[PDB]
Structures are given as C-alpha cells and as structure tokens.
C-alpha cells in the first residue's frame, strides 16, 4: 500500500461514542472487512475516540473457546474477536468500552504483533452484587443490607437474585470491605451471605432473617458473588509479541487478562482497578487480575495498578498432566485433571519435558523430549482432555503409572518474568503467584493491604495441577504493608513458599531452588514473615521489618521464620524495628 500504517478512525466508519447503540455488530462487520483486505505484512490501527461505546450480546460472534483456569461454558459470547489477524493495534483516547450481559469483551486468538492501548473495559451490570450493611442485630441474626444504586435484583421464593441482560444469578459467598479504606475486613476471607430467607423492606433494602456475623458492622460493604467464572476480560490464546499499554479492566466475570500458550507479553500501565478515589464500587474482577497459563518467552508486567479483585493480581504457572497409562517404553497417555483447565494444547514436538513423582513432589533428573503428541478424541468435536505423547528417549521402568502417581511438566512452555513497579491492594486471596523455573524479577512493587499473603510460590500435582518448581527468582526492593489480615489456602506468612506435598516426611529432593529475598520492607502487625517448604537455596538478606498495631496479631504460625525441609539458607543484614536478627 501507499501507507505505512492504515489508520481507521472508527467514527469515519459509522461507529461513534456516546451513541448508546449496540457497537457489537458494527465493529464485528467492520473488522471482518479490514481483515479480508489487509494482506499479512500490512499494518492496521483501529482508533476509538473519547466517550463510551456499549456492546451487547446481539450480533456478537459465538466462539467455542477453552480457557485456562475458567469454567468451560460454551459457546462464549465474544464482543471483539481479533482472530488470525496480525500487526493490529486497538487504540483509544480515554475510551470506555462498556459491555452488557454475559460476554467475553476482547479475544486475541492466534495473532502476532497485537497491541492494545489507552482503553478501558467495564460492564454496566457486574454479576458481583455490591451491598452495604444498614443494620445488624447480632442476637436475632437479622441483617438489613442496601443494594448499591446500579444493582437490579429479583426476589423469588425468599431468595435474592442479582440480574442483568439475559442473566440471573444467586450469590452464595462474599467479600466484606472496611468502609472508606476499602481494605478487606480483618479475619473475614470468604464468608457466607444472607441471600436465602430474605424479604424486601423497601426498594433496595433487603432483610436477611438468618444471617449471623458480628463482623459485618453498619457501614461494611459486601461484594456478594458466586464461584462462576466463564469468561475473562481479555482472553489471549497462542499469541506472539502481545502488548497492553494503559489498559484497565474494571470488571469481568472471570479474570482481567488470561493469556495462554502465548510467547512474549509486554504490559505497561495495565490496571485491574477502580476509576479513582470517587469510584462507588469496592470490587473489580470476579477472578485474578492477570493470569499466564503455559506461556513462554519474556513477560514484562510493569507500572500497573491492581485493586479490589476477587483473587490474585498475577498468577504465572503451567499445567502438570497426569499419566494414566504407559503403552510402551516411549509412549504414554496423559490427562488434564482439573475441571477448569482443559480443552487446549499442552505441547509440541521438540518440547523439553520432565516427570514428577506426584506423591512426594520429586522430579526425575531424566528429562525427555516430545517426539509426537496427538489428542485422543472419540468424536472430532470433543474437547481435548487426553493426549498420547511419544518421547524420543525411552522411559526408565520406574516411570509407570501403575507403580505410583506420575505427572509431566512442560519445561519449554515456561516464561521469564519481570514484575516491577506495580501496586497491589485490597484484594482477595494472595497478591502474586509465581511458578516458573525461568528467571523472575519481582521488584519495586507495593503490596498495600492484600487480604492474604503477598507472594506465593506453590506447585501442586494433586489438586490444582499447576506447575512451578522455581529455580531462579529475586524478590527485591518491594514494600509489604499489613499483609495477611485474612486466611486463604496457603497463606502461612507474608511470603509463603508452599508447594502442595502429600508426603513430606519421605521427600528426599527439594522442590524449589534459587530463591533470593533481598532488601524488602515488611510493615506488619503480626509475626509470620517467611514460610518455606522444600527449598534448596534461600537467600534472605538486607530486609527491614517494622512492627505496627493497626490490627491484632492472630496468625496460628507465631514464628517470623518457619522452615520445613529447607537447606541452603543465607541470612544476613536483616533487622526488626531497626535491631539486627541473626541466625548465629
Ligand atoms: O492456587 C491456584 C489457584 O490460584 C488462584 O486462586 C486461581 O484463581 C485458580 O485458578 C488457581 O490458579
């Protein structure tokens, strides 16, 4: 073409801000055309203006997607489908993409060199229900709660439903928040909610007749929810060189950003957050803010704001298949085991694999290489639950599924990580999960009142089936303020290194190695700073621990440092309230 970049200002093509019309069928039809014309090396930009674009289900594409760490409800109702479309940039100018009903806002499928920039994603009617405690009669167990202004509910058979366009969902749990600070209420975590046995006092004032909780003082704001997570805000599958710059996801029925089987991801200014100090909402995403399942290359996530999520800010991990059958010396059948991670590819020819003894979480040193890999399917349409993997090298007969439980990590689909200069706060569960053997830098982050623990290095081939023996990770120059006001799975200390190990007494081999924790600041009211299970090599140096009394100490673990099957400890130049603490 006669142009280096072909720029499509959307308003020039019949797609205007603040029209209040359904943008879905228009942008869909338009992209389809721009695609059919642009050859491959051709570069494209799609440009939104200031103001608001609404997207509804009607006229949306219906894609069958399998999404890591999410409910496998199909089809998905997809707002914007970037599919097999390269060198494309979606850009806005303080733009507000507003979605309605149950939708997957943005899907990036099998696309390279995609950039998303200066653009916000939100739903008008979040499936999460915000309410405010009006009166709590602790004796009778009567709570009156006020629905927030934007909430449309129905009562049917004394049951509280939350509604939006084409959906109706009864909340079963919640997260309580301090009024004002927007912290999560001390020792709350997941709590039951009084959505059964209800009746209407007056519009937007609901009486719960059998709700007993002394913690829900007048003023407390509660995010009532279910466990459903069918679609993330931005889904990315099989991307190469993907970019997000100044992109905020304010809410989605699932994770903010879920990227899988993607090589190289760059994020500057990514937020999953509120619209500022004046946002009436206390909550953001129904699940994790950002999530990276089975990625590779380099992941940069910097200068982000994550707040009020119903889960972690970042989670970086792979998937252990479980071997169900050994056909011969070279060939096994292996299966996806969790309900929320199946239906997508796991590896390719030439991938490096290693095997794990699930019961004691011990690696075999003998690595292998995939020679062949084919999903096993009765009908073509069926989803990928089960593979037949062939290795180049023969397997030592000790690797037989009828002898013990054996898992497979794909060491090729593992990304390197830079997670710097972010702010995480006021969110459910942990702050950040890292599970990658590749080099990882976690630096100059602020963990301001995470509900659970700040950082979690896990690994589990029994429950979650999420890989991550760590080998190389520096957690430096971070600030951790009053982490762990509430318990969740694995929250044993501000930094918890907690692999899921069924049989620890019999473990000979250390699961994690090469962990350096240098020059951090821990502002805490409690005791537990570091918990470490099954580590060979653990540096803890130059760290400052400052005590405060913003809350009562309470954690069962009353030890600053708690090690279990840990060798290789280097511990120097640490302080507590400006006084040294040495091992010797
Ligand atoms: O501990 C693993 C767990 O971490 C978070 O809670 C995610 O929401 C889950 O999908 C899973 O990744």
Numbering used by the authors: 34 to 617
Text taken from the publication that reported this structure:
The galactose is bound in the active site by an extended hydrogen bond network established with several amino acids. Interestingly the position of this tryptophan residue shifts if no galactose is bound. Thus, a similar inverting catalytic mechanism of the GH110 enzyme class can be assumed where the three aspartic acid residues function as the catalytic residues. Interestingly, at the same position of the recently discovered α‐galactosidase of Akkermansia muciniphila that was found in the human gut, also a tyrosine residue is present at the position where we inserted the substitution W260Y in PpaGal that led to increased activity, even though this residue is not directly located in the active site.
Thus, removal of this additional galactose yields the H antigen of blood type O. For this, we characterized several previously unstudied α‐1,3‐galactosidases belonging to the GH110 family. Analysis of the structures revealed that the core β‐helix of PpaGal is surrounded by two small β‐barrel domains (domains I and II) as it is typical for enzymes of the GH110 family.
